């Protein structure tokens, strides 16, 4: 044996896309705020992240999460997201999973009715409430940032062949792109999607040339991840079926709450039912997220709403994660 | 917390190629020989092995081993191998992970210079060398089945759009399928071979139609899975590059252990060198295995040689993995 | 971090009294019967069992076990039985545990009802049937080895403090010798638990040399390795309670099994109880198991008992221990 | 299973004296200093403590700690100690653990000729510097709180045998009482461990109440939790041997580095031994410390000498606890 480093991760997934929460293996992350604590992880670390992110460890579409310290005394603790792609601000699927893992271990003590944790993250402060059946976690309500639509319509180029036929545009804590599959020769099952993420994916690049906007007020983003396809469910509880691809090259096996807390502008102001409705949409492994308004803030530009989204994560092992100085692929090997 | 199921396994990587080994969680498998021992594997289990390949545990292209006991009485501990597709029947750059991890935790006694284990696996008793400096693991040669060339020339329809030009066969304990790029347009680099993978898998089923042949002598494989694309190197320490797709729809991150064991088989009697001398053969990822010829046993039919292969596997953290009976997921979710 | 060996194990207690479980920390271990497994550790290894049982990993007292392959049909795993002093041929509250821990972590199907575990002493082939409640074990009823009074009476020496005279020994898988705390004059309290492990073992040694001491069948035996106090209860829910000293000078905190299977035995024979009737024999700790005789039986020179005693395991944390080969005491301290 | 909470620690031990490291087992403990930080355990929780440092995980002796966040600029990160009976303000041997693990697991980036870690205690801010020998530690120069003789001579009382006269009292991070073996009549073999013991912590309890008692600073203090046994030596490498009696009723396997930093303390001050010179102080079990005086300074009422001690920690395995919520002793059992 050897080791060096030895890093302390228990495995999560919440319908389908995992999640690796590191719990022990670096005990303080030196920051004020979760932002800085993540800035002081990028640089510095980034390598812990690609180590776990990347092959032979993790995989392509891999992602997770470090459990660190609050410094903000609300309560609880503090969490960074992380993927094979960098960083995420905020990633649902993944909220999920930290506060059911928090729970279903000892790291915060359970109500047993609902235990609302709320942890840090480089985002807004996230509120959690962990629907516990005298035992164990059943699932997590989320409420997500105010999301809404951006400007109805729009379309670009598409090669191959069509040209034609118009998308969308909207927010949901990251913006997203809108495709009704029409747009031609997808089917969004385990069988196939291998034109959907490189068709997919190629948009992400092709828009990033114009038609882009900041979110009015802050200033991050600029422009476009997070693309998502859509189009009539196959699990019957649900309605439409539909995934997103992001990251470097991924598709989310999860529904994906970003994308939900997106794109539910739409069942307001857009027709189609108005507010504190059921949403219940799933993704192409045919698992389901449950989506509902709650609010419905205005704001004086655009219309917006506060959603609550929910989901359910089951720990999938726990890890002890040891990297050899002698290992040519001792950090993240990618493909 | 839960868990109903609860298997201790340790993460290698050989040149990529990843390797769950299974050390602890399942203490007796009841087969007399290690073949029935798998087919005992195969029913009963085989979801421990969908648990911890397929997602949200393992991924396409992941691969691991069982150490079991011997019941053989040479020595050392009995192992099966197992991948997304099944249960292979060898699995060198999992012969490497195997012997590495069994030497460089306390599971056999270290010699020194190079340790000798013979593991039982459902194939023939497998023999692997491990060089060992003072402290730690280098590498592990491992000694191959009797391999040979099969049929020189031919070629089948190929779509898109050439028709056109010929290719290979040969052994390498299971058949391969040998293809020189120029066929079209591949460049087997991490940036793409998504082209790659489809338009080789395709093959392994397109072949199947004829061209069958069994081994003369034993009957298992009858046809075609282990295809292989190759042509010239970027590491200068090699010869060649290529890579090969197998079991489900995965890529090989390393070299191909069974791969090079066959087509050193081409090196003598079709040219190029003779017998026992240097080989270094390099997979997409850039990493390199060594062949070399040994003994060349002619046999009746054909002419064949017995290979030494040399990998080197690093562990890749300590797994506790544990499978949650409410886990819709709890066994291999797939795509 | 370099480490030579690693060691994965499953920290149990039963009614106190903790058992270290060895889980695939080595893969095969060879010897025909469980009693000449037993002999290659003891004569190898025993080194393992130093450095788990002595500090700085266990303590004085502290037991456990390594579960194996079986050789033996019908078995569903092998067992040995290992403590501070030595190898013990059966242990109960051992036997608990394995038993316990292997429904428990899914290393067999849980029945549902009653779930029938057969282990390889190796003593002799044991049964437990773990009582499971739905979701999990509520309690072991395992059947031991066929126990027998042996000698009746029998004497004893004179050092510290003064003569005395009678007493009695028997055999419960592991051979005894019994006395009323009248002989020796303690009180069996923590208050003098000191006095009883000096005054334990110094017997242990001083009717040992000396007495004829054999079992008709086993043939390895010739060794009677546990002392057993014993005086009326405090506890009204159970009837007379017992502390057993054993292997170096250690104390068990458990009723001790094969010490109640042997006490029970010396009944039934010496009248008072009269078969299928409740003994619930508690330790020093406030801790009980419950025995009961059975399907009577002879040994080859005297009519025997067959016991069943049932206790509790709990698991108390999952163990990877590692060995320093720098580390001076990477094996047993001892103190 | 079921376990409800699961703590990861790391097993050291330093010359003996095991340290249960817990490591990101629970994300953040909020007291402002590592003192209230030590209150919010203690006062919540302390039974993780029990659960760990009791039977049937822990044993009586036992040591460990929590590595926590700083709060404390400079400092790496936080640590707590914890034992048997309670919560020590500072340990020697478990601030060398505390070291050494940080460093060999990678938890902090090893500086090749010296690595210098700051925790906190809580007594103060305590700097470590860890010898690391290009591959692996070598030992660990942690230097103390100021420390200084208090009192000179001093009063005792009867109780078990005879009244006899005087001893000394001292802080060394921890407050102390020290006796030459005379006036007692041991001698610190493991022969007597027992009545070192029981004799020590009756002095423990019988000079409390009673004496004066406190630290100038801190005004938390107040209490002399170990009393330390002192005489000649065995080994020659060593001068004047020690064991330390505290909590609850334990001995200290290792010398005790608050308690040679609280010897050497009253030396200098008594004369003998005069700044920078050796001195190697050794305990029961035959491993020994090497302290040194260093910077002088004084603490508001009398002249301090700020020592530096050296000794060395080995990791013996890593821990997943966990506690099932059935288990009768599921938090600290006791004996
Ligand atoms: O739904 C989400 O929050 C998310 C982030 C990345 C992929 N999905
Ligand atoms: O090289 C090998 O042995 C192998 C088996 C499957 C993929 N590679
Ligand atoms: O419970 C038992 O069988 C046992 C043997 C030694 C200590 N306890
Ligand atoms: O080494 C020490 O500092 C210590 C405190 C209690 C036991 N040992």
Redesign the interface.
Same mark, same amino acid.
């Given at each position: /044996?050897?080791?060096?480093? @030895?890093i302390?991760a228990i +495995?999560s997934?919440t319908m389908?896309?995992?999640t690796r929460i590191?719990?022990? @293996?670096? *005990?303080?992350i030196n920051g004020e705020t979760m932002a800085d604590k993540k800035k002081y992880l990028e640089d510095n670390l980034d390598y812990v992240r690609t180590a776990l992110m990347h092959?032979?460890?993790g995989?392509? #579409? /891999?992602f997770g999460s470090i459990?660190?310290?609050?410094?903000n005394?609300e309560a #609880?603790? @503090?969490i960074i997201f992380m993927d094979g792609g960098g960083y995420l601000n905020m990633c649902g699927h993944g909220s999920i999973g930290a506060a059911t893992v928090?729970v279903?271990?000892? /790291?915060v003590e359970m109500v047993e009715p609902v235990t609302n944790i709320n942890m840090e993250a480089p985002a807004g402060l996230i509120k959690a409430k962990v629907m516990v059946e005298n035992?164990?976690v059943k699932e997590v309500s989320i409420t997500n940032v105010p999301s809404f639509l951006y400007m109805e319509d729009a379309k670009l180029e598409v090669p191959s062949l069509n040209k034609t036929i118009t998308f969308d545009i909207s927010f949901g804590g990251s913006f997203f792109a809108i495709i009704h599959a029409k747009e031609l020769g997808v089917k969004v099952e385990?069988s196939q999607? +291998?034109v959907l993420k490189?068709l997919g994916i190629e948009i992400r690049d092709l828009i990033n040339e114009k038609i882009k906007v900041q979110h009015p007020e802050l200033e991050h983003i600029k422009t476009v991840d997070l693309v998502e396809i859509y189009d009539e469910p196959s699990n019957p509880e649900a309605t439409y079926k539909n995934v997103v691809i992001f990251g470097q090259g991924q598709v989310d096996?999860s529904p994906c709450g970003t994308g939900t807390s997106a794109k539910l502008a739409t069942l307001y102001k857009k027709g189609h039912l108005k507010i504190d409705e059921k949403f219940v949409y799933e993704s192409?492994?045919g698992?389901m997220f449950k989506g509902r308004v709650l609010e419905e803030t205005k704001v004086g530009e655009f219309d917006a709403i506060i959603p609550e989204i929910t989901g359910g994560a089951?720990?999938? @092992?726990?890890?002890?994660?040891?990297? #050899?100085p002698? #290992? *040519?692929?001792?950090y993240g090997?990618?493909?």
């Amino acid at each position: /044996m050897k080791f060096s480093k @030895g890093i302390h991760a228990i +495995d999560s997934h919440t319908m389908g896309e995992p999640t690796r929460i590191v719990v022990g @293996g670096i *005990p303080q992350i030196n920051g004020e705020t979760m932002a800085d604590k993540k800035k002081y992880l990028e640089d510095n670390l980034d390598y812990v992240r690609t180590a776990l992110m990347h092959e032979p460890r993790g995989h392509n #579409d /891999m992602f997770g999460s470090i459990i660190t310290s609050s410094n903000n005394k609300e309560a #609880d603790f @503090g969490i960074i997201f992380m993927d094979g792609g960098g960083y995420l601000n905020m990633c649902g699927h993944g909220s999920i999973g930290a506060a059911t893992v928090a729970v279903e271990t000892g /790291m915060v003590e359970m109500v047993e009715p609902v235990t609302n944790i709320n942890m840090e993250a480089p985002a807004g402060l996230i509120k959690a409430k962990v629907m516990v059946e005298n035992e164990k976690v059943k699932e997590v309500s989320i409420t997500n940032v105010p999301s809404f639509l951006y400007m109805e319509d729009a379309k670009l180029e598409v090669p191959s062949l069509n040209k034609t036929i118009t998308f969308d545009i909207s927010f949901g804590g990251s913006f997203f792109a809108i495709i009704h599959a029409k747009e031609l020769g997808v089917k969004v099952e385990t069988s196939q999607v +291998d034109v959907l993420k490189k068709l997919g994916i190629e948009i992400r690049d092709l828009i990033n040339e114009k038609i882009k906007v900041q979110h009015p007020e802050l200033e991050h983003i600029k422009t476009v991840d997070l693309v998502e396809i859509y189009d009539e469910p196959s699990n019957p509880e649900a309605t439409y079926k539909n995934v997103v691809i992001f990251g470097q090259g991924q598709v989310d096996r999860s529904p994906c709450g970003t994308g939900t807390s997106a794109k539910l502008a739409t069942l307001y102001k857009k027709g189609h039912l108005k507010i504190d409705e059921k949403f219940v949409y799933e993704s192409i492994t045919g698992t389901m997220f449950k989506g509902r308004v709650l609010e419905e803030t205005k704001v004086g530009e655009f219309d917006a709403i506060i959603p609550e989204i929910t989901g359910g994560a089951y720990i999938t @092992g726990f890890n002890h994660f040891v990297i #050899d100085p002698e #290992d *040519p692929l001792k950090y993240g090997f990618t493909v």
